[PDB]
Design a protein around this ligand. Sequence first.
Ligand SMILES: Cc1ncc(C)c(N)n1
Length: 167
Amino acid sequence: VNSFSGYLKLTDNVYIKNADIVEEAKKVKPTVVVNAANVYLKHGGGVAGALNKATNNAMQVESDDYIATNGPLKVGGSCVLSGHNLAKHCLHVVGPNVNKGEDIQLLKSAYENFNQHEVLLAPLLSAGIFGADPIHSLRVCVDTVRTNVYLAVFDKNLYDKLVSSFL
Ligand SMILES: Cc1ncc(C)c(N)n1
């Protein structure tokens, strides 16, 4: 049994809710919240911008030190950093950004990072300002992630379309 409330069950392991990942993280304090990161961990907008704002910029400070030591992530890659006031850990995952011309096949690689964590609160990778089709992102999630994932979807309109169209 876990703390997550109000989710619709899509599959054995994938659950979805119309929610603000920030407000959901603040309520649940999950072991892992996933950030929709870029390779530079520059958390300027969308999921990354909102999560970072909720940490009072502590996520960005920590991220800048990570990049100065390790250099950029790979598209499709991830790193584990602090969850600050939102979660125990933040899994920063880089989905491909279609608005930069990145290969959408890297979306599966991105979701494979979730399998290293038994339970996660996450957004749909490569959705929103990353430019991918969220319907496609949800399909790749369901077909890739085997651990228990609780998806928070920002738009009520998009949420209803994801549920109605789910196979
Ligand atoms: C799931 C989600 N996507 C985007 C934003 C900004 C947010 N707060 N939550």
